[PDB]
Amino acid sequence: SGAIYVGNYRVVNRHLATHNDWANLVWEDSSRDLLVSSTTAQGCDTIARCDCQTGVYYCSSRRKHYPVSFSKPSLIFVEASEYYPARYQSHLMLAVGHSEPGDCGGILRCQHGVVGIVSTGGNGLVGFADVRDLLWLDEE
Ligand SMILES: Cn1nc(C(=O)NCCc2cocn2)c2ccccc2c1=O
Ligand SMILES: [Zn+2]
C-alpha cells in the first residue's frame, strides 16, 4: 500500500483505490494503474519535474529503502496479475530490485521529489508508475 499527497490531491494505484477515492475521483487511467482523488486537507509531498534516472524507493516486503537506476517511462507488456489481465502498461519505469504485490504504493523519489509509485513486478524487476508528467497536480 501507499499514496502521494500533493495539494488537495491523493494519488494511489488504481487497483487499490477505495470507494471514497472513486466517489471523489479527479482522474484515472487503467493503462497506467493510476487514480487521483480530491482531499479536504492539504498534502505535503512535492512532485519531481525532471528526467532523473536514479533515486530511492521504499520496499515494504524488506522494510528497506533501496537506491536504484531506472528506465525512462515506456509502454511495456505486463503479465496477468490478480488485478489486471495481461496487457501493455504505459508510463512505466523499471529497475533491478525486489518487489512483491503488496509493495504497490511504495514511493520512488529523486533529489527533486516524488517520481512515481510501485505498480508492477516480475523477472527480478520492479516497475513504477510515473507521475512527473501530471503537471496539473502542482496547481488548480
Ligand atoms: C509490485 N508488484 N506488483 C505486482 C502486481 O500484482 N501488481 C498489480 C497491479 C498490476 C499492474 O499490472 C499488472 N498488475 C506483482 C505481480 C507479480 C509478481 C510481483 C509483483 C510485484 O512485485
Ligand atoms: Zn529528479
Q: Do 92 and 38 belong together in one domain?
A: no
Question: Based on the domain organization, do 24 and 57 belong to the same domain?
Answer: no
79 lines ligand 1 (CB under 6 A): no
The structural domain count of the chain equals: 2
50 and 109: one domain?
Answer: yes
Name the residue with the closest Cα to ligand 1, atom 10: 120
SS3 string of the chain?
Answer: CCCEEEEEEEEEEHHHCCHHHHHCEEEEEHHHCEEEEEEEEEEECCECCCCCCEEEEEECCCCEEEEEECCCCEEEEECCCCCCCCEEEEEEEEEECCCCHHHCCCEEEECCEEEEEEEEEECCEEEEEECCCCHHHHCC
**Is 133's C-beta closer than 6 angstroms to any atom of ligand 1?**
no
Task: Answer yes or no: do 16 and 53 share one domain.
Answer: no
Domain that holds residue 93: 45-140
Tell me, yes or no, whether 54 and 111 share the same domain.
Answer: yes
The residue written with cell numbers 503537471 in the block is 135
Structure determination technique employed: X-ray
User: If you measure from the C-alpha of residue 67 to the centroid of ligand 1, how many angstroms do you get, rounded to a whole number?
Assistant: 20
Residues facing residue 135 across a β-bridge = none
Q: Which residue has the cell 511504495?
A: 106
Resolution to 1 decimal place, in Å: 1.4
Asked whether residue 67 falls in the same domain as residue 17, the answer is no
Q: Are residues 28 and 79 in the same domain?
A: no
* 59 and 125 co-located in one domain: yes
Q: How far apart are CA 37 and CA 20, in angstroms?
A: 8
Q: Report the alpha-carbon distance of residue 116 to residue 132 in Å, rounded.
A: 7
What does the alpha-carbon distance between residue 51 and residue 122 come to, in Å, rounded to a whole number? 24
Distance of alpha carbon 127 from its chain centroid, rounded? Answer: 9
Shared domain check, 69 and 20:
no
Same domain, 16 and 76: no
125 shares its domain with 61: yes
Cα gap 40→131, rounded to integer Å: 21
Residues 26, 14 share a domain: yes
Give burial (CB, 10 Å; 0-12/13-18/19+) of 45.
Answer: middle
